[PDB]
Design a protein around this ligand. Structure first.
Ligand SMILES: Nc1ncnc2c1ncn2[C@@H]1O[C@H](CSCC[C@H](N)C(=O)O)[C@@H](O)[C@H]1O
Ligand code: NA
Lengths: 264, 265
């Protein structure tokens, strides 16, 4: 008679917490969505095998328009689990689903999992120094999103790092690469000319966090724009003012150029 | 012949990931530290029982001063694990530990787990709206730090939420409760009078994140400052202007007063 929102983690089926696994295995029905992010190191089959249940995957429309018609009805008479990549509530609108659950008289519980939001720690950038985050969205038709550019500007003025979630078109199997994000940002700069993102801007790329060998690279846009960072998912980060120890990590672990040491 | 930084997660022994547990079980030596934070929903004994290996606890000095003499040497001929509450490398100084490993010729890998940085999502506050984070520290002697108050001011001014970690003295096991944090912030407000943190400020308190039964409470300082949020540690958040959906979540899930719909949105 309850609903569990359970995160599956960053890259593969084993990124689920022990808590999440033991609970999922005992749920009567298991639902999931894989449109909010990409778990590049696993498959629906491997996940089902792990928890030993058949998983009904839902589309964004199924969730946003019919969560209360598809999932909640079963939660009224059974224990139901709703799985999501990473942490279920981070950079999604799933939190709102708990309100729906309540209205339907269904108690809900959240089981966290490693999220890209904290995995940024592996870039060596102090996590407390990150400011407002944003998402680089694919332009659509004549509509060209640019608010994310202003976020970078605002954080940079404060010396804070900016985390940029990258766009995803799950149904089209399209996952935005850090390269595509950089290209878009350069075009926005050419339009706004705020000196926010140029060929000389230091950026950090984190690809496939959660995997054993994620790609962690740092350097100037002019040098990374055409670099191959491997398969998606990717996140792009625009550091603010660096502490010496952050720069040292970027240099020795992420291959950044020695010049970034002159933080002042 | 490798070092694994493995996160223990949020609250109890089941907050480690399947990957983290399986790797820890394959390591010849397993170390851990609980000075950055504690695992309040479990005990060292339960964690050791789960992993099935003796766990050697290291002090702040053992780590900061002698990581290369205690942990790294063993990675030359063995697989070693270094367990930390939350997600590895989140604590400010831990990333440098990877640099030490590399400089010492030791390959290292990071196995992630849930962190409070992402788990605060359960407050219903949009993660992208969080700005710079800070820690509320106790004043000592002739030193009265107030930077955390300025962080709140700068974030709120830009419509951003502020995640506030509360002072902790692991060894002594002395915690600053959310109540104590509010009292301190009010004192700072009286000093700077910037209109940043007052009796009318809306705040959110999160305790025992990770547990199946966390305490999530939202309301004005005047009403929550003397409320009992249960056992520490507590996390304090000062939201910036709210999206109506965030407000509705705080009301339905965190018991916030309906007044926030007309005052903080
Ligand atoms: N393992 C990973 N490596 C790199 N980027 C990742 C990632 N997982 C998610 N992302 C980034 O975040 C975007 C999804 S946003 C949803 C995030 C998810 N709830 C979480 O907690 O992680 C992706 O398009 C990508 O830009
Ligand atoms: Na943050």
């Amino acid at each position: 008679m309850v609903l569990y929102f359970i995160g599956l983690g960053l890259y593969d089926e084993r990124d689920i917490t022990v808590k999440g696994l033991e609970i999922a295995k005992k749920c009567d029905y298991v639902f999931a969505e894989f449109y909010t992010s990409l778990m590049a190191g696993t498959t629906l089959g491997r996940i089902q095998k792990l928890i030993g249940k058949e998983i009904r995957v839902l589309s964004r429309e199924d969730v946003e328009l019919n969560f209360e018609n598809i999932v909640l009805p079963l939660a009224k008479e059974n224990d139901v689990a709703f799985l999501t990549p990473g942490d279920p509530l981070v950079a999604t609108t799933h939190a709102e689903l708990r309100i729906r659950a309540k209205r339907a008289g269904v108690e809900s519980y959240v089981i966290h999992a490693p999220s890209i939001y904290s995995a940024v720690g592996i870039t060596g950038l102090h996590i407390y120094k990150f400011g407002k985050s944003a998402t680089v969205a694919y332009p659509e038709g004549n509509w060209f999103p640019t608010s994310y550019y202003d976020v970078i500007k605002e954080n940079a003025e404060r010396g804070l790092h900016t985390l940029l979630f990258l766009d995803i078109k799950a149904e089209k199997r399209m996952y935005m690469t850090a390269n595509e994000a950089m290209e878009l940002l350069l075009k926005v700069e050419d339009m706004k000319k705020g000196g926010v993102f140029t060929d000389d801007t230091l950026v950090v790329v984190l690809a496939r966090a959660g995997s054993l060998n994620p790609t962690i690279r740092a350097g100037y846009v002019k040098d990374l724009i055409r670099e191959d960072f491997g398969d998606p998912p990717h996140i792009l980060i625009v550091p603010g003012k660096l502490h010496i120890v952050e720069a040292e990590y970027l240099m020795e672990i992420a291959g950044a150029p020695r010049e970034i040491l002159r933080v002042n």
